[PDB]
């Protein structure tokens, strides 16, 4: 189906990206409510990208997992091109989380695994996203986790591991391991003020449990986050892992 503009109504921006923008829509004919993401042709060619958004529609197009974010259709106009997003109402991960310090390990082993699960569908297909973080996961109505954003889903650093700042599904293993931390702790394990100094950090592996991360929690990260990409575990061993395993739902 080709579409155009002229089809939605727009309510309020949702955010604000380097390359546009995502705003609240709705579709004229079913009254269908969704998020539709705006960016300038202009601005994409200067920075030459027009593949990462071939190559992310061929891509969130083709997939359908309930944690993945559902990317409905495509279209453009003279100067930008619109991308038709599923809408998920409780915003994203990042602002929850933010908005009230860390996670207690239910709530962060919940979705860790439903972002395994998400994710050992994605790489069911060979697929990784390369791109994970708090502001790329979202929170359906149900409280779901959902996962967006495929700038890099082919086939600032604090989540990439080593492989890729210097890779297969091991990539993402390691940023889960990343993710989880930040959702526990507050922080990514490699904070760093400056550029270089992170690298650093994630270079050598430079991360310390404060007191409080009780348990194989603290194991299941080392777990994740090792610099081998051959030695992390799979999503299998990681929803079976028992810390997860006691708290998830
Ligand atoms: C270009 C560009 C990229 C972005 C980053 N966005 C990606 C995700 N965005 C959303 C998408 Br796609 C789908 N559903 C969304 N729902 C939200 C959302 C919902 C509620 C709230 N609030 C704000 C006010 N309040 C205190 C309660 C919670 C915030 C966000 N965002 C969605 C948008 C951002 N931007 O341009």
Redesign the pocket.
């Known amino acids: 189906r080709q579409w155009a503009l002229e089809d939605f109504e727009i309510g309020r921006p949702?955010?604000?990206?380097k390359?546009?923008?995502?705003y609240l829509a709705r579709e004229k004919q079913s009254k269908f409510i969704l998020?539709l993401?705006?960016?300038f042709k202009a601005q994409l060619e200067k920075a030459g990208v027009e593949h990462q958004l071939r190559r992310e529609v061929e891509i969130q197009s083709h997939l359908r997992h309930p944690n993945i974010?559902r990317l409905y259709g495509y279209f453009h106009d003279a100067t930008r091109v619109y991308l038709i997003?599923?809408?998920?109402?409780?915003?994203?991960v990042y602002?929850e989380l933010q908005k009230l310090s860390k996670f207690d390990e239910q709530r962060t082993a919940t979705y860790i695994t439903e972002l395994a699960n998400a994710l050992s569908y994605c790489h069911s297909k060979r697929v990784i996203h390369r791109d994970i973080k708090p502001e790329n996961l979202?929170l359906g109505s149900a409280g779901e986790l959902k996962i967006?954003?495929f700038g890099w889903s082919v086939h600032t650093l604090d989540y990439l591991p080593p492989e890729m700042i210097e890779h297969d599904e091991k990539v993402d293993l390691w940023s889960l391991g990343v993710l989880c931390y930040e959702f526990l702790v507050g922080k990514p394990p490699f904070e760093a003020n400056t550029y270089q100094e992170t690298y650093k950090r994630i270079s050598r592996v430079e991360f310390t449990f404060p007191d409080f991360v009780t348990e194989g929690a603290r194991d299941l990260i080392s777990r994740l986050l090792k610099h081998n990409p051959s030695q992390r575990p799979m999503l299998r061993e990681v929803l079976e892992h028992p810390w997860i395993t006691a708290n998830s739902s």
């Open positions: 949702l955010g604000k990206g390359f546009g923008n995502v998020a993401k705006v960016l974010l997003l599923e809408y998920a109402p409780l915003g994203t602002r979202l967006a954003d």
